[PDB]
Symmetry: C2
Subunit: 586 residues, 2 copies
C-alpha cells in the first residue's frame, strides 16, 4: 500500500467491505509481477503459453463464448438527467443502477484476490495527466492493463497524496466457496457496464472480455474522457494518429476517424508505397486533442495496440505483424497451431490443415465456423513497433495538420475531398456513414457507441472548439476507399496505396493544390494524385472521384432524418451547413 | 361516473392526483364523440379536414419533426430481474423507473383534459377478452384508438365492476399555465415508453406519436401480450392473417411474420393473380394464437389498419387504396394537395406540380426531400375494407394452415421452401435476417423490437407450443420475394404474383407437389409453380429457388454467433436444429 491518499484508501476500504475479496494487492506494474501473473493464469487454464522460439513471452486466452465482445443493451450512461445521455446512449437512473450493481458486487470477490491497479492515460511526464484506479478480480485484466496503459507505482505517485482520479470498479462476478475449483475464464450471465459522468466512476460486472473489463479502453479513454473534454474545453476522439514524413523529411501528422475495425489500424500503421515517403504510428484508436496556441495537438492516451486479429497479414499490415514478431503479446480467442503458434483467418499462408480453435476444438478448413473469433485480438505494447513514432510517449502532443473522416461507400462519396472550414467539417463528420432511407449506417465522427453524453451537444463541442479555435484548426477531409465499378469491382486498390491519397492531402493543405469543385466540397482533381505504379498504366478510374448529384439527392432525406434524430442540441451551425449542402445538390 | 369498478376508480384518482388535469372525461366510442374531437382538433390546428367530395370525414395530422417515430433508445422492459428483460431489450429497474417518470408526470396535464379510454383487444363478443384502459391528454390518441381498437362504453361494461384490465398511462408532457397558448402538436424533448410485465402496466411520456402514444398497438398488442402469452400458454406474434379461398370451395388461413409493415400489408391485402383464388384480410400486423382442438387458431387483436402510406398505390396494393376510398381515414404526415386531398411518394398520381409537405412547407418535384414522411400513416377501420374477411370479428379465431417467415435477401434464401416440422421452423424463425461476416440484419420471428421478455425464453415458448400441439401444428415456410440476378435485377415480380407462391404453399400442404431437397428444407420446383400469365419471368424463377451452399456456409459463423447472442435460454432444441443445418451445409 504505497500511498498516503485518504480518498483512495477509503474507497478501496468500502469496496473490500462490499466485494469481500480474500486478499488485496496493490499492483506495481513490474515485469516480475507480470511473470508471476502469467504463471498463475497458465496454472489456472486461462492462458496457454505459446511456443517460446516462435513467440516469446506470449499467451493465448480463450473466452467463454458468451462473453466475447460488446453488450450495448447493458452499457449505460448514468447521468443524473436522461437528456445528458441523449438519444445515442442507453440511460437508467444513477442511484438505482448503483443499488442494482452492489446487489451483484456484494461478495463477488469472495475466494479471489482484489488487485488495486493505478494507471495513467498518456505520458507519465505530462505535468497534469488523466488518472484512474481499477479494482478487479481478474489477473487477465491486470496484464492487459499493463500493456494498454502506464500502470503501477509511477502512476500511484502521480495520483499522489491529494490528486484525483477516475474510479473504476470491476468484478467478473464469479465468487468461489471454500475448497471450490474455478474455471479457465470466470464470468456472469448478468453483465453490466455503467458509466457515471458526474462523479467520474466506471463500474463493470460479469465480463472478463476486452472493453467491458479493461475499463481504460473505451469507457475511460472515450466515454468518460469525452465528458471531461466537454467540461474542460478539449476533445476525446476515436482517432488514429499517424505521422507522415516526405522525401524532404518534413513531418506532418494526420488524425483520422473511421468506423472500420482495423480500417484505422491499416492506415495508422501504413507503409507508403511511394518512394521517399515513410510513416510512423502515434496511436491507432483514440486521440485526445487540445488547442495550444499555434494549433490543435493530439496525444494518444493509450500505451498499447489492442487490434482485431483476422485479416492481419504481411500484405495488408506488415507493420502490425512486425510488431508481434518479438513476441510479448496477449492473444485472445485466436486459433492454435500444432507448433504452439497462433493463426487466424486472413493470415499469409493457406489455412493449415489442423488447428485448435478459439473454443478448444480440433479444426480443419472445411469447418464453416471460424478458427479465430471475428472479434479476436492481439494486445502488444506500442514501443515494440518498428514504426512507433519517436514522440508517441511525449506529453507535448503532435500538431495535427489534417483530419480525415471516412466510411465504406460503394458509391456517391469521392475517394478524397477537402471540406470548406471546420463548421462544414463538423457537419460532414455528423453525417459520417457506410453502405451504398434507413439504408445508410450512420456513425457520426466514428463515435457512435462512445459519446458519453448528449450527441448533439457533442457536435456543439466541435463547433465550440472551431470558434474558441479560429484559423489554427486543421482542415477536415472526407475519404472513401470503397467506391465500386458498375461491374462491382473495387475502383481504388487501397492498402499501401492510400499513401497517394495522404500525399494529395498534404499537397492541399500547403497549396500545390488542384481541386475541381463538387457538392461535397473541394475534391481531388485526380491527376494532382501521384499515380505512378497502379492497376495497369493509362489508368484513371476518376469514377472513384465523382459525386453524382442524383446520388447525393438520394441521400438528402435520410441525412435530414438523422440530424433530427440527433436532437435539440444539434447546433444551429450544423443545420445551416446542411441547408447549404441541399442548396448545392439542388 | 359510469363505473362501480373500484380498482379502476382508485387508479384514476391516483393518476388525477399526480397528473393534475383540469378535467376528467370518460370516452364513449360514439361517432358523435369522434366528430366532436375532430372539430376540436381542426380548431386546435392539430388536423386539417380533407376535401369531403374526395375523402369524406378524413383528416391530416402533422406532427413536430422531433416526434416522428422511434425512441427505441428509451423503450424499457422493466422486469424486476434484468434477464427477464434479456439481450434484445433495454432494461431499467422498475421502481426507479416509476419515480423518474412520476417526476415528469407530476402536473403534466395542467391546463388539459384527462381522457379515460376503455378498450377491448379483439372481438367484443369474446367471453373473456383482453381489456385495457388508457389515460391520455391527447384527443388524437383517443381518435386513433377508436379506429385501432374496440373502444368506449361497450369495453367499460365488459370490464364491469370486477374485471381486470391493463393500466396504460399517457401524457404528451406539455402542461399549460393559466396564460399559456397551446401548440398544434404538443410533446416533450424527454420521451419514455416503459412496460412493467409483472403488473401488466404500460407507461408512456413525452410523445403523441404512433406507437409511443397509441398504447394498444405494439406495447399492449405485442410486448405486454407476449408476457401474458408466455404466462398463460398461447402466442402473441407479429403476423398478418390472410384468408385465401381456392377454386371452387376451400378456405385456407395463412399467418406470416415479415420484418416490414408494407411487406406484410402487401401480403395481407393481396389480390391474387391466378383464376378463381380470392384473398381476404383478417389482419395485417399482430396475431394472437392459441391451440384449440383441431389446430392453432388466430385472432386479430386490432380493429384498424395503421400502415405505412408511402409506396401505396392501385398497382401495388389496390385493396389498401379501395379500403380508403370511402374516407373515415386519419392520415399522419402525408402531403397535402392545393385543393385538399393527400399524396405520398409512390402514389399512382405521379408528380403533382405543388404539394404542402408534412412539415408545412411548399414542395415541388424539384425538392430532394420527401413530401410524405417515410413512416407516414393512414389509419382506417378494417370493417371498411372491400377485402375484409367476414370472420375477422369472430372470438373463436381462424385455423392456421401454414405459417410463413420471410426476410429481404438478395441471395441465399430460396423463393419458398418448406421446413421439416415445428422445431425446425422455430430455428428458421430464430435466424430470420435481411440486409435490406456480421452483415445480416437479424429479426427473429419479425419480433425483435417487440419481445416483452427474454428472447431465448421466447424461442422456448415456440418449442413448448410445438410440444402441446404436436401434429395439430401448421407447416412453417421460409419465403423470399427479393432475390436478385447477376445484373442486380429481381428474379420474381412479387406483388400480386406472390399468390403463385401462396398456391404452392397450399398444394404442398395437401401433398400435390414434390420438392427439391436443399440445405434449407423442401424448396419449390419451378415446374410446380406458375399458372402462366406470369408476365415475362422466364425460369429466372429457377435462379430465385436456388440455395447455393457456399452462400449458406458463408452465413454459418454469423448465425452461430447470433444463437449465442440470444443467450442461455435458447432452447437446446434450437441449437440441435442449427447443428443439423451445419451438417447439411457440408
Amino acid at each position: 500500500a504505497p500511498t498516503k491518499n485518504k480518498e483512495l484508501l477509503n474507497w478501496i476500504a468500502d469496496a473490500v467491505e462490499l466485494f469481500q475479496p480474500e486478499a488485496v494487492v496493490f499492483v506495481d506494474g513490474s515485469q516480475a509481477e507480470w511473470d508471476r501473473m502469467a504463471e498463475d493464469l497458465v496454472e489456472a487454464g486461462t492462458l496457454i503459453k505459446l511456443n517460446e522460439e516462435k513467440r516469446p513471452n506470449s499467451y493465448l486466452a480463450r473466452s467463454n463464448p458468451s462473453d466475447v465482445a460488446r453488450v450495448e443493451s447493458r452499457t449505460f450512461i448514468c447521468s443524473e438527467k436522461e437528456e445528458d445521455a441523449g438519444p445515442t446512449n442507453n440511460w437508467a437512473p444513477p442511484q438505482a443502477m448503483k443499488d442494482e450493481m452492489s446487489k451483484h458486487y456484494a461478495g463477488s470477490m469472495k475466494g479471489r484476490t482484489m488487485y488495486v491497479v493505478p494507471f495513467c492515460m498518456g505520458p507519465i511526464s505530462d505535468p497534469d495527466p488523466k488518472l484512474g484506479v481499477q479494482l478487479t478480480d481478474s489477473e487477465y485484466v491486470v496484464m492487459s492493463m499493463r500493456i494498454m496503459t502506464r500502470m503501477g507505482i509511477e502512476a500511484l505517485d502521480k495520483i499522489g497524496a491529494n490528486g484525483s482520479f477516475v474510479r473504476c470498479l470491476h468484478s467478473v462476478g464469479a465468487p468461489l466457496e471454500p475448497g471450490q475449483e474455478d474455471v479457465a475464464w470466470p464470468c456472469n450471465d448478468t453483465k453490466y457496464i455503467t458509466q457515471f459522468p458526474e462523479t467520474k466512476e466506471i463500474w463493470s460486472y460479469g465480463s472478463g472480455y476486452g472493453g467491458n473489463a479493461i475499463l481504460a479502453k473505451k469507457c475511460y479513454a472515450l466515454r468518460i474522457a469525452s465528458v471531461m473534454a466537454r467540461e474542460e474545453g478539449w476533445m476525446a476522439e476515436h482517432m488514429l494518429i499517424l505521422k507522415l514524413i516526405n522525401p524532404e523529411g518534413k513531418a506532418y501528422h494526420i488524425a483520422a476517424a473511421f468506423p472500420s475495425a482495423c480500417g484505422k489500424t491499416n492506415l495508422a500503421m501504413i507503409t507508403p508505397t511511394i518512394p521517399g515517403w515513410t510513416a510512423q504510428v502515434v496511436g491507432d484508436d483514440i486521440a485526445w486533442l487540445k488547442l495550444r496556441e499555434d494549433g490543435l495537438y493530439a496525444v494518444n492516451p493509450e500505451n498499447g495496440f489492442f487490434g482485431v486479429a483476422p485479416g492481419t497479414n504481411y500484405a495488408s499490415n506488415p507493420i502490425a505483424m512486425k510488431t508481434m514478431e518479438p513476441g510479448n503479446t496477449l492473444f485472445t480467442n485466436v486459433a492454435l497451431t500444432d507448433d504452439g503458434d497462433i493463426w487466424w483467418e486472413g493470415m499469409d499462408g493457406d489455412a493449415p490443415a489442423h488447428l485448435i480453435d478459439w473454443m478448444g476444438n480440433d479444426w480443419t478448413p472445411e469447418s464453416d465456423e471460424n478458427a479465430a473469433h471475428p472479434n479476436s485480438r492481439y494486445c502488444v505494447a506500442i514501443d515494440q513497433s518498428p514504426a512507433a513514432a519517436p514522440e508517441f510517449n511525449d506529453w507535448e502532443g503532435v500538431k495535427i495538420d489534417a483530419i480525415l473522416f471516412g466510411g465504406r461507400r460503394a458509391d456517391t462519396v469521392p475517394l478524397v475531398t477537402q471540406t470548406y472550414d471546420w463548421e462544414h467539417g463538423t457537419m460532414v463528420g455528423a453525417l459520417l456513414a457506410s453502405g451504398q432511407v434507413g439504408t445508410l449506417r450512420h456513425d457520426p465522427m466514428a463515435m457512435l457507441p462512445f459519446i458519453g453524453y448528449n450527441a448533439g451537444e457533442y457536435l456543439q463541442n466541435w463547433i465550440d472548439m472551431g470558434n474558441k479555435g479560429g484559423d489554427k484548426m486543421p482542415s477536415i477531409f472526407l475519404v472513401n476507399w470503397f467506391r465500386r465499378g458498375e461491374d462491382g469491382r473495387f475502383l481504388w486498390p487501397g492498402f499501401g496505396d492510400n499513401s497517394r491519397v495522404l500525399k494529395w492531402v498534404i499537397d492541399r493543405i500547403e497549396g500545390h493544390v488542384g481541386a475541381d469543385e463538387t457538392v461535397v466540397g473541394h475534391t481531388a482533381k485526380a491527376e494532382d494524385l501521384d499515380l505512378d505504379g497502379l492497376d495497369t498504366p493509362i489508368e484513371d478510374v476518376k469514377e472513384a472521384l465523382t459525386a453524382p448529384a442524383e446520388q447525393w439527392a438520394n441521400d438528402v432525406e435520410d441525412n435530414a432524418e438523422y440530424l433530427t434524430f440527433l436532437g435539440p442540441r444539434v447546433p444551429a451551425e450544423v443545420h445551416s451547413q446542411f441547408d447549404a449542402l441541399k442548396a448545392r445538390i439542388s
